[PDB]
């Protein structure tokens, strides 16, 4: 479903990378290489957040808490339950 003046603007080209491999629309949204990357990263982050919420013991929106590791771990990696999920979600 397009606006009454939208069709003439829906042309091909103007991509930084990908050409016509990802040059199309899904509803109103425009898809590209970076649309695919955005969808992947956002879905992974959301699902990881809800996995951490399930393992915490609460699904209350006000009470979900995912926290960074302790100061003793420094700049290294922490166990995924003791603050590593936070690092993954940050990435």
């Amino acid at each position: 479903a397009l606006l009454s003046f939208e069709r003439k603007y829906r042309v091909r080209g103007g991509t930084l990378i990908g050409g016509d491999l990802f040059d199309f629309w899904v509803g109103p949204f425009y898809v590209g290489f970076f649309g695919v990357t955005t969808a992947f990263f956002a879905l992974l982050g959301t699902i990881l957040i809800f996995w951490g919420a399930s393992q915490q013991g609460t699904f209350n929106p006000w009470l979900i808490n995912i926290a960074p590791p302790d100061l003793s771990y420094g700049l290294g990696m922490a166990p995924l339950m003791e603050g590593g999920l936070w690092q993954i979600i940050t990435i």
Binding site: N65, A67, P68, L71
Partner: protein, 51 residues
């Protein structure tokens, strides 16, 4: 994750109190009292706390 911490410069953590070395240069070990030792009250005229 609560933000509860105390920051300090590393160069300031390595600097001790400049008066600690003064105390260690003006202290001495105690002397164990002997049998029938003469007290300071029998050698001078002083105050009872220090007698």
């Amino acid at each position: 994750g609560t933000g509860m911490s105390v920051p300090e410069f590393v160069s300031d953590l390595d600097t001790p109190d400049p008066t600690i070395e003064v105390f260690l240069a003006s202290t001495s070990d105690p002397v164990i009292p002997e049998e029938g030792a003469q007290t300071a009250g029998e050698a001078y005229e002083n105050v009872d706390p220090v007698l």
